[PDB]
């Protein structure tokens, strides 16, 4: 919060009091803790009512140190995710200059909940046992439209990992992340399309649109209307199956099967097929355009700019072809004809409206010829021209209903929860800061420093150096997990079951998944997490050119751990294990937004432990730093990415060192710590130089001893501040020597970028949009970093320390609120006066299928009877039990 | 015009075997030869190993 | 490159005769000539003299 | 520079276990009748042809 008088921010929380463990459970972060202070909307509105477009802005009064007032002063919201591929330059739009970002995920298997075979199974088995009495080789056991020999070998060997689903899910938010940029330009922000390229006006009346490979540059189009992966370079297969014995034997293992219950809306359910056979493809199979309406910032002139999204250029590996094994519609002896075939098949595929070229060439609406034994050759098609068909076709509502048929089969609430917090994590970004005095600055356009950029971990994004497709991969960014074909075979025919595979009801996905109001609110929900990140970089003191080589050096033990402690590179038991400074982030997270970061199981042994997306970052990347006003870099601070006063407006609690300065009262303004908390002044043998009160440690130590570096302490930290803040500080060493990392020109701080302004608004001033926390204290080399001012400059900030002077600054005129949380579901609902008329009947039908997994109306008991030999059925002398992790026991020694 | 329809398996009220059924598995566990000669048939019309 | 093995007998775990297998000797004792008879089979395939 | 086709031998493909050589292997029939006597009476009658 802000606050009002020196009282409050000297009775602020320490560091490490919000950094404890917490015990107690919260609410998930829905992002509408932000909405209902940068917005009209207080408690629920149409969207289209609402004009969200103008919604886009921190606003309010600014008091001046000089003693005036500037109302309607304004802030722009820090993140995005569309990169822009044609710039504004001299008013006239044109081509870009630079490379597209890059992205990268290191997929792979782990641990989950543990999982236990069903009933459904163990009749399956006494079905085979009771028909070996028999010389007939009969079909008893086909379920579901699919052939007695497949459910046969879809019942064996299971997998103790569990089952996962969530690459899954991240392919399907990513996807709708996108084609939630299709509604109507009413309700999404202005400055969304302008963070990067403030050059540039959108206009609200024209919708944005989207496309597939249709970049102007550097070869981004993967090959057009013919088209190639962009990563791999290469292009998939794809194949349909009504049994599996068509499939080649160089792939039988690797073939999934198609539930019925998808596909069951009288919605097409051709396109359902596109977008279940998409969601476990290779991601991206093509780069996704935004192509929209803007303008110059005098409005006059206009044309149509091309964005790339964030979540297409993000990498999720996978499968290159797919066997699609299709539910048959009559139960039938296997179609050795075709006729047979095609008109018992569930639903016959065919591709998506829209033509490709190339070799198997795709006219649009074009038929698949099925797979059946005896046929006169095999047929396939490429699977980027498949998908290329469809990609016009899926839109936020259809992607809506898919996933409440899917929640019915599988529960998919706290799993997509958790995949959109992954979208989150790897989509939003913004660009890096640039140092000044006053309030303002942004890099010149079309400049590489223009649209270099950063996560919301202080982490920059790669770019690519080459063109489209790309030659070679790049380093993975983080770790997921990934989603095995058996198991999902096994799980979808209800074979097995996990606890948190347990189903659920079409009404429990989020509420995000079906709005238009969806991108807003993921462009909001990315702050809290570099508020977390930025008061954890915060508390220690280190550089950026000192983080950035940091993992490797041999100067300093301490600094060596300080890094590898901080990312997911460690194992047990076989499963992943969280990183191990990522739980003081999470911590610290819970302790001041007082809500709770969604979290995914990993079982050591049979032990859940909780993964949050602060735990799973991996090593390679540069840090965040600002550029100077010419574009040199500036290597001296600790990594930053926005302005305080988003850190210190938003938080329910605060650290002590990162409170805002008060407003001036009468006699008093802001005030300084002294010996009396235990400080101390440095001094050296130059005479015309003065450094703040700081720790009594740092008197010995210019240079850090090997195994430690500076300790959390907040009062020093503030009097680094204050030192700061002046506008004319000195960076030097023990001796007032200069450090090696590169430093500001003179008295200049990093500020929030610049946005084209409206009619009434007035820009930041001085230092109320500026970067403060930022306090060097730990060089490259492994000195301290002091903050110098000369004696005569010196004397009114010690006083202030001393509390017998006082030191003027600038402030927000903004009081304190924070709501208590709008949503416990973590989805939207509201009875209808039909809801109410038949209540009961679904709230017990409801938990009369959440037991039903895997049950049939037949019990064991029923079964028995038609049994030849009761005794030698295997469910007798195997009662089934879930398996234990890592894996179950075999051989015991008697 | 055109109708279709869904037709589905039926799962709900699952059989139960008769003493005969009953007593025919038995003489399959005890492997009683007899009972399914070649040319033994039922009043029924249909032969025994049927 | 080539390997070799001693492969050897197995007389761990001794088998026990079924009721099945001792009716049926007590059959060949009392000599009941009738349920070896020429055509009898089971429903495995297999012919009852065998 | 010089792409090809190379040969490899599995190592499990040079163990050597058993080595039993000639196998005689019965197998059930279809129908409950007697000892198949003439050619077509004998390959008719089998569960499944080798």
Same mark, same amino acid.
């Not at 037949?858 to 079964?863: G, R, V």
């Given at each position: 919060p802000?606050?009002?008088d020196?009282?409050?921010?000297?009775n602020a929380?320490s560091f490490?009091?919000?950094?404890?463990?917490?015990?107690e459970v919260?609410?998930p972060?829905?992002?509408?803790?932000?909405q209902t202070?940068?917005?009209?909307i207080?408690?629920?509105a149409?969207?289209?009512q609402?004009?969200?477009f103008?919604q886009?802005?921190?606003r309010?009064?600014q008091?001046s140190?000089?003693?005036l007032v500037?109302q309607?002063?304004?802030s722009?919201?820090?993140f995005?995710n569309?990169?822009p591929?044609t710039?504004?330059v001299g008013?006239?739009?044109?081509?870009?200059?630079n490379?597209l970002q890059i992205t990268e995920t290191n997929?792979?298997?782990y641990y989950?909940?543990?999982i236990?075979?069903t009933?459904?199974?163990e009749?399956?088995?006494?079905?085979?046992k009771?028909?070996?009495?028999?010389?007939?080789?009969r079909?008893?056991?086909?379920?579901q439209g699919?052939?007695?020999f497949?459910?046969?070998?879809i019942?064996?060997?299971?997998?103790?990992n569990?089952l996962?689903?969530?690459?899954?899910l991240?392919?399907?938010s990513l996807?709708?992340?996108?084609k939630?940029?299709?509604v109507?330009?009413?309700?999404?922000?202005?400055?969304?399309?302008?963070?990067?390229?403030?050059?540039?006006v959108?206009?609200?009346?024209a919708?944005?649109?989207?496309?597939?490979?249709n970049?102007?540059?550097?070869?981004?189009?993967?090959?057009?209307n013919?088209?190639?992966?962009?990563?791999?370079?290469?292009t998939?297969?794809i194949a349909?199956?009504?049994?599996?014995?068509?499939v080649?034997?160089?792939?039988?293992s690797?073939?999934?099967?198609?539930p019925?219950?998808?596909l069951q809306?009288?919605?097409?359910?051709n396109?359902?097929?596109?977008?279940?056979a998409?969601?476990m493809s &290779?991601?991206?199979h *093509? #780069?996704?355009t935004?192509?929209?309406?803007t /303008?110059?910032?005098?409005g006059?002139? %206009?044309? +149509?700019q091309?964005?790339?999204?964030t979540?297409s250029?993000?990498?999720i590996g996978g499968?290159?072809?797919l066997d699609?094994?299709?539910?048959?519609?009559?139960?039938?002896?296997?179609?050795?004809?075709l006729?047979?075939?095609?008109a018992?098949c569930?639903?016959r595929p065919?591709?998506?409206?829209?033509?490709?070229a190339?070799?198997?060439?795709l006219?649009?609406?074009?038929?698949?010829?099925?797979?059946?034994?005896?046929?006169?050759?095999?047929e396939?098609?490429?699977?980027?021209?498949?998908?290329?068909?469809?990609?016009g076709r899926?839109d936020i509502?259809?992607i809506?209903?898919?996933?409440?048929?899917?929640?019915?089969?599988v529960?998919?609430?706290?799993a997509?929860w958790?995949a959109h &917090?992954?979208?989150? *994590? #790897?989509?939003?970004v913004a660009?890096k800061? /640039?140092?000044?005095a006053?309030?303002w %600055?942004? +890099?010149?356009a079309?400049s590489?420093?223009?649209?270099?950029?950063c996560?919301?971990?202080?982490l920059?994004?790669t770019?690519?150096?080459?063109?489209?497709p790309l030659?070679?991969?790049?380093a993975?960014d983080?770790?997921?997990?990934?989603?095995d074909?058996a198991?999902?075979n096994?799980?979808?025919?209800?074979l097995?079951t996990?606890?948190?595979?347990v189903?659920?009801?079409?009404?429990?996905?989020?509420?995000v998944?079906?709005?238009a109001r969806a991108?807003?609110?993921e462009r909001?929900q990315?702050?809290?997490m570099?508020?977390?990140?930025?008061?954890?970089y915060?508390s220690r003191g280190?550089?950026?050119?000192?983080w950035?080589?940091?993992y490797?050096?041999?100067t300093?033990?301490?600094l060596q751990?300080?890094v590898?402690?901080?990312?997911?590179?460690?194992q047990?038991?076989?499963?992943?294990?969280?990183?191990?400074?990522?739980?003081?982030?999470?911590?610290?997270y819970?302790?001041?937004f007082?809500?709770?970061?969604?979290?995914?199981?990993t079982?050591?042994?049979g032990?859940?432990?909780?993964?949050?997306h602060?735990?799973r970052?991996l090593?390679?990347?540069?840090?965040a730093?600002v550029?100077?006003?010419a574009?040199a870099?500036?290597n001296?601070?600790?990594?930053?990415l926005?302005?305080d006063?988003?850190?210190?407006?938003?938080?329910?609690?605060?650290?002590l060192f990162?409170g805002a300065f008060?407003?001036a009262?009468?006699?008093n303004?802001?005030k300084?710590?002294?010996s009396?908390?235990g400080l101390?002044?440095?001094?050296n043998?130059?005479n015309?130089?003065v450094?703040?009160?700081?720790?009594k440690?740092?008197?010995n130590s210019s240079?850090?001893?090997?195994?430690?570096?500076?300790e959390?302490?907040?009062?020093?930290?503030w009097?680094?501040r204050?030192?700061?803040?002046t506008?004319?500080?000195?960076?030097?060493?023990y001796?007032?020597?200069?450090?090696?990392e590169?430093?500001?020109?003179a008295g200049?701080?990093p500020?929030g970028?610049?946005?084209?302004?409206?009619?009434?608004?007035?820009?930041?001033?001085?230092?109320?949009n500026?970067?403060?926390?930022?306090?060097?204290?730990?060089?490259?080399?492994g000195?301290?970093?002091?903050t110098y001012?000369?004696?005569?400059?010196?004397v009114?900030?010690?006083?202030?320390?001393n509390?017998?002077?006082?030191?003027a600054?600038?402030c927000?005129?903004?009081?304190n609120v924070?709501?208590e949380?709008?949503?416990?579901?973590?989805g939207?609902?509201v009875?209808?006066?039909?809801?109410?008329?038949?209540?009961?009947?679904?709230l017990d039908?409801?938990?009369?299928?959440a037991?039903?997994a895997?049950?049939v109306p037949?019990?064991?008991?029923?079964?028995d009877?038609?049994?030849v030999?009761?005794?030698?059925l295997?469910?007798?002398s195997?009662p089934?039990?879930?398996?234990?992790?890592?894996?179950p026991?075999?051989?015991?020694?008697?």
């Open positions: 802000i606050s009002a020196f009282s409050e921010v000297e929380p490490l009091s919000l950094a404890e463990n917490t015990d919260l609410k972060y829905t992002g509408l803790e932000i202070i940068i917005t009209n207080v408690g629920d149409n969207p289209n609402s004009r969200i103008d886009d802005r921190l309010g009064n008091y140190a000089g003693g500037t309607n002063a304004v722009a919201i820090p995005t569309l990169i591929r710039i504004r008013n006239i739009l044109v081509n870009s200059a490379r997929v792979s298997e989950s909940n543990p236990i075979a009933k459904l199974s009749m399956i088995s006494d079905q085979v009771n028909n070996q009495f028999s010389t007939w080789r079909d008893n056991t086909s379920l699919f052939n007695a497949d459910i046969a070998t019942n064996t060997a299971i997998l103790p569990g996962s689903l969530e690459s899954m991240l392919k399907l996807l709708h992340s996108i939630a940029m299709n109507d330009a009413a309700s999404i922000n202005r400055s969304q399309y302008q963070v990067i390229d403030h050059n540039t959108p206009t609200i009346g919708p944005a649109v989207v496309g597939v490979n970049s102007p540059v550097f070869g981004e189009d993967c090959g057009g013919n088209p190639v992966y962009p990563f791999g370079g290469g998939g297969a349909f199956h009504v049994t599996l014995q068509t080649p034997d160089e792939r039988k690797y073939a999934i099967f198609v019925p219950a998808i809306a009288t919605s097409d359910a396109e359902a097929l596109a977008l279940f998409l969601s &290779e991601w991206p *093509a #780069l996704y935004v192509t929209k309406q /303008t110059d910032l005098a006059a002139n %206009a044309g +149509q091309v964005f790339i999204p979540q250029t993000i990498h499968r290159r072809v699609l094994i299709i539910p048959r519609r009559e139960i039938a002896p296997n179609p050795t004809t006729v047979a075939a095609n018992m569930m639903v065919q591709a998506g409206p829209d033509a490709t190339g070799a198997i060439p006219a649009a609406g074009q038929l698949f010829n099925m797979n059946f034994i005896g046929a006169p050759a095999f396939e098609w490429p699977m980027t021209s498949y998908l290329y068909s469809w990609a899926f509502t259809t809506r209903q898919y996933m409440g048929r899917l929640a019915t089969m529960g998919v609430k706290d997509y958790a &917090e992954l979208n989150v *994590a #790897l989509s939003q660009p800061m /640039t140092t000044a006053g309030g %600055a942004a +890099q010149a079309n590489a420093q223009q649209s270099d950029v996560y919301s971990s202080l920059t994004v770019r690519s150096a080459a063109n489209f030659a070679n991969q790049p993975a983080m770790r997921v997990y990934d989603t074909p198991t999902w096994k799980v979808a025919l209800g097995a996990a606890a948190n595979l189903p659920e009801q079409s009404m429990d996905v989020p509420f998944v079906g709005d991108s807003f609110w909001l990315a702050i809290p570099c508020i977390a990140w930025t008061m954890y915060h280190i550089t950026t050119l000192a950035d080589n940091a490797t050096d041999n300093n033990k301490w751990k300080m590898r402690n901080t990312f997911s590179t460690t047990s038991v076989g499963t992943i294990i969280p990183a191990r400074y990522g739980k003081i982030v999470c911590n610290l819970k302790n001041m007082h809500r709770a970061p969604a979290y995914v199981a079982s050591v042994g032990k859940e432990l909780h993964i949050t602060f735990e970052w090593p390679g990347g540069t840090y730093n550029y100077s006003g574009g870099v500036v001296c601070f600790s990594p930053v926005i302005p006063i988003w850190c210190q407006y938003f938080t329910a609690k605060l650290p990162a008060p407003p009262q009468g006699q303004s802001t300084g710590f002294n009396k908390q101390m002044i440095h001094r043998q130059n015309n130089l450094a703040p009160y700081l720790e440690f740092a008197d240079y850090f001893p090997v195994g430690q570096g500076p959390i302490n907040d009062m020093a930290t009097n680094g204050l030192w700061m803040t506008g004319n500080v000195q960076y030097l060493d001796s007032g020597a200069a450090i090696v590169a430093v500001p020109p200049e701080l500020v970028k610049q946005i084209p302004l409206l009619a009434g608004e007035n820009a930041p001033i001085e230092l109320t500026a970067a403060t926390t930022c306090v060097p204290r730990y060089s490259n080399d000195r301290r970093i002091f001012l000369t004696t005569a400059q010196s009114i900030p010690v006083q202030a320390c509390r017998a002077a006082n030191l600054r600038s927000w005129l903004l009081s924070y709501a949380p709008a949503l416990q579901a973590l939207d609902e009875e209808d006066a039909f809801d109410t008329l038949t209540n009961s009947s679904f039908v409801a938990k009369s299928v037991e039903s895997g049950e037949a019990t064991k008991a029923l079964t009877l038609q049994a030999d009761v005794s030698s295997p469910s007798t195997d089934s039990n879930v398996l234990s992790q890592p894996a026991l075999m051989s015991p020694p008697t």
